[PDB]
Amino acid sequence: ADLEDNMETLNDNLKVIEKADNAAQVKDALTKMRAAALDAQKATPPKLEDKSPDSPEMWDFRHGFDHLVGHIDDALKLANEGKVKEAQAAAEQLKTHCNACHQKYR
Ligand code: HEC
Ligand SMILES: [Ca+2]
Ligand SMILES: [Ca+2]
Ligand SMILES: [Ca+2]
Ligand SMILES: [Ca+2]
Ligand SMILES: [Ca+2]
Ligand SMILES: [Ca+2]
Ligand SMILES: [Cl-]
Ligand SMILES: [Co+2]
């Protein structure tokens, strides 16, 4: 999957998590979100295509997904213990990091 597909996976599973009814639905959504974020991390955003792959902007873009994965992992620990409401709250707090990267590179 390319970068925009990974981003659509993140956006879709976000809406899934807030509409979810049980911990299984939340755990499956977070697992796909983890893979999409790690896959997106290997991509180059169109706005940075004329920058070097080694540029500080590209490393900042990659580091943003490291932090996002950390939050998905923390939310995964909550969903694995049946705490769907806590997991839904954690998944809602991803949005501040979604927006912060987008303001720079989207
Ligand atoms: C930087 C480390 C990012 C974080 C974290 C998130 N997004 Fe993202 N997003 C990023 C870029 C550089 C782009 C543009 C890519 C392109 O090919 O144009 C996007 C785009 C989106 C989109 C629109 C997809 C499209 O077809 O253009 C959506 C709906 C989107 N992003 C959602 C999204 C969500 C829900 C995130 C948190 C889970 C998130 N993004 C994080 C860069 C980064
Ligand atoms: Ca891919
Ligand atoms: Ca697009
Ligand atoms: Ca595509
Ligand atoms: Ca698509
Ligand atoms: Ca529902
Ligand atoms: Ca327990
Ligand atoms: Cl709960
Ligand atoms: Co954070």
Number of domains in the chain: 1
Q: How was this structure determined?
A: X-ray
The burial class, CB within 10 Å (0-12 / 13-18 / 19+), for 28 is middle
Q: Do 43 and 1 contact (CB within 8 A), yes or no?
A: no
**For ligand 1, is residue 44 a contact (CB within 6 Å)?**
no
Smallest CA-to-CA distance from 67 within 30, 38, 104 is with 38
With left for phi above 0 and alpha for psi between -120 and 50, is residue 82 left, alpha or beta? Answer: left
| Ligand 4 ion local residues (Cβ < 5 A) | 2, 5
**For ligand 1, is residue 17 a contact (CB within 6 Å)?**
no
Residue identified by tokens 């990267």 is 101
Quick one: which H or E segment has residue 106? none
End-to-end CA distance of the chain: 18
**Overall resolution, Å:** 2.0
Host domain of residue 22: 1-106
Residue identified by tokens 């049946």 is 82
List, as residue ranges, the binding site for heme b: 7, 102
Side-chain-side CA neighbours of residue 82 (13 Å)? 0
Rounded-to-integer distance, Cα 79 and Cα 94, Å: 15
35 SS3 class = helix
Quick one: which H or E segment has residue 73? helix 56-79
